[PDB]
Symmetry: C3
Subunit: 331 residues, 3 copies
């Protein structure tokens, strides 16, 4: 077909790869959810994805990786988190100019880390996004004249946690909001749209997403996390990403790997709290760093039993197809 249609297909698959989903319809649903949440944030994310894919094409990256969407799933997060942590409000058009520039750095990093990560057959997990956004938010800061950012500061007083005022409806609603917080969206409806987008592709990914989000919520209750943060979904996006990554895609789905994924979700939630407290000193948020560290430390794990099997990266599509491939190769 026309090259423009193929490029938009690449953009859609890139914006879907965030929850490790390669499906253009899932991309359309995710874009619709972003419009539901905040049109400005969605515009920023779409611009980030588009410029990231242009940078990937310019730098003569692999055509298969671009077609899959491997080079667009960092631009969308870059744009969305540029828009989320902007202190100038909505439709601050000049914010698009950083978004164009920083999204150019997503492919480069994605290649560079790849050269590092090829030696241990490790895939990159949105690390280009974390590095680029940390770079931007540190360079600008809350006291920038042009692109001020929302002020994040370390807690200097003991939080007041009235356990009699906990609301279990909101605590349960933290699950879809935890799913939607992967992109930075806090609207429960866009969380539901995201859950539908994952389910239309593969039910195992949706199940592991829900399990990871609820595990992050529970792990955040364990260390007396303020209730507003949990209700806002801040404690479940690293956990849901880790659960999706370790559950059935990069490990062949098995009950052993399922328990490993739950453990990875717990590790990612605790590391999320830790990185939030540490990075608040610089004024930066822990944007998907915890998921990266936990998933990478759980993919490098070497275990003797044959149930825990790590797939080669060349043959990773989605948990059902992964299990089918493992069963075919074994027989």
């Amino acid at each position: 077909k026309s090259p423009v249609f193929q490029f938009f297909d690449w953009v859609l698959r890139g914006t879907s790869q965030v929850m490790f989903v390669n499906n253009p319809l899932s991309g359309i649903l995710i874009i619709l959810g972003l419009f539901i949440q905040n049109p400005w944030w969605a515009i920023s994310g779409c611009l980030g994805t588009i410029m990231s894919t242009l940078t990937a094409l310019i730098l003569s990256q692999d055509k298969s990786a671009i077609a899959a969407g491997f080079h667009g799933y960092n631009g969308v997060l870059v744009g969305l988190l540029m828009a989320v942590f902007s202190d100038k409000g909505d439709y601050y058009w000049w914010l698009l100019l950083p978004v164009i520039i920083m999204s150019m750095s997503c492919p480069i990093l994605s290649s560079a880390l790849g050269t590092i990560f090829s030696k241990w057959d490790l895939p990159v997990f949105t690390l280009p996004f974390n590095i680029t956004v940390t770079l931007y938010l540190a360079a600008t800061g809350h006291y920038n004249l042009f692109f001020p950012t929302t002020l994040l500061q370390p807690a200097s007083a003991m939080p007041n946690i009235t356990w009699s005022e906990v609301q279990v409806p909101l605590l349960l609603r933290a699950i879809p909001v935890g799913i939607g917080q992967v992109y930075g969206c806090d609207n429960p409806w866009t969380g539901g749209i995201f859950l539908i987008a994952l389910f239309i592709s593969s039910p195992l990914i949706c199940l592991h997403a829900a399990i990871g989000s609820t595990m992050g919520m529970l792990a955040a209750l364990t260390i007396a996390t303020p209730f507003d943060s949990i209700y806002f979904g801040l404690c479940g996006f690293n956990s849901t990403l880790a659960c999706i990554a370790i559950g059935g895609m990069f490990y062949v789905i098995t009950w052993q790997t399922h328990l490993l994924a739950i453990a990875c979700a717990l590790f990612a939630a605790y590391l999320g709290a830790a990185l939030a407290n540490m990075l608040s000193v610089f004024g930066l948020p822990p944007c998907t760093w915890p998921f990266c560290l936990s998933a990478l430390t759980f993919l490098l794990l070497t275990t003797n039993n044959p149930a825990i099997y790590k797939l080669p990266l060349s043959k990773v599509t989605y948990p059902e197809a992964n299990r089918i491939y493992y069963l075919s190769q074994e027989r």
Copy 2:
């Protein structure tokens, strides 16, 4: 014999591996020293070791490594440093619940880092402990409602150092206290018990431990470190660990390697001061990070002369046996 006795043997060897010693009697002496220092801290450390070894067995790790104690020497430090930096006092029983959870992460990290470190034949040096404890102490912080930690803050004023008030008896006693501070214990008697525990296995390890501790003390006097910190042994545990690691075990013991070990002790003490000042910003202590960085940067050193020889990890037991093996292989 009965599996329980073998498991307790594994726990003892694990709690001895901290100073790179593989001897159950040394483990018994170290546990006795911990009881001498603080029974609560010792209970926490023993629980950490036990749950770390259970996690290692569950994750089907190598049986030889578990039997040596390679998977228990991070749990003991994790438990001990959970107990040391607890603001709730002694016998705060709920602190055991983090200790169980965090000690599960010691084997995983120990495997993961191993997969990273196998490419350069580097052994892991309590990095799982540092990562896990940094995670915990950052997640909780001093203002946590459930598990508050002791407050560490950067120095904001010039220390007052009356050099006429220096006490050379305490300055000398900083050596055994420096040895005992590896576990977090400040009692001089438990430092002496630790020195006995190292000596009963191999005198070279004890000699290098004393040299490293005194080198850390001297290096801390060089940059006007407050006298209370030196008397408390805080400046000599990274140095003693680095001296033990580089002295005669991972390098064949020779006067060249001895001077290299002294240099590594100096580097580790200065890096310890640096990491203390940096990490105090987040409120975290430099728990054995300096020893890790210094020993890793000194094992990667490539030198043309044949005197400085680095042993393959498969054949590292203790300095006397290491030198015997080197002399046998050379001839």
Copy 3:
């Protein structure tokens, strides 16, 4: 000739390797520029270079690398930045004692990182300097009794930027000052001497240095950097180093690689602002870390087109000779 003359030749080539130049006359010009700027800083830098080369010889490093100057280009920066960030003024003779000690750590790190970086054929880019100086400045701090450092603190208020008061003469003069700031020198005359020193060896290196400095200046205007910082040259030394590294030496010089070098300069300037803001929290400056990170992430970049070619490290001299070698090997 006499060994002393060869040793001084090694020192000169080492002090020239900072801008990736291997020429003793360039070393003489750089030393002259340092005397023009500040005799105390130059004395500190020369002592650092000398002791670094002695440490390299003692540790039996490669004779070819020492003769090239590969082990002296970290000592000079170490000494110069010890002297620049000293709060005791000029000719504080005791500062030489750290300078001797810390410069011993430049070869060790240079070897250690090499063992890490040999797997991906990456050269080390003054990382030993960054690690050592960060170690020193964190260990001492602004409140040290013996070697206090200049106080660096994060910005806590919005800067006042009167754009009508911008001075384009000083803005243009930020280019030679940006070149001279690689060593920490702020004098425009020593910047001109440095430009002459680069040009006498290879015009491409000088051109890329000027382009990188002006690119860093422009990138610093983009995020509303205070005018005093830009006039002082603080925003152009990481950028000029990155432009020199990526322009024509480690990549065969081509218009594609030229655009890549400009992009690397932009990335390095933005990362320089980010690292300045982050490291100001600890009180440390971003001493050449941004150039390191940007150049390393741009050398690991893998690109399919044949124009972007990365040379093996064994055959990298300077851009003209590099292009000659590439053209000879291709034919």
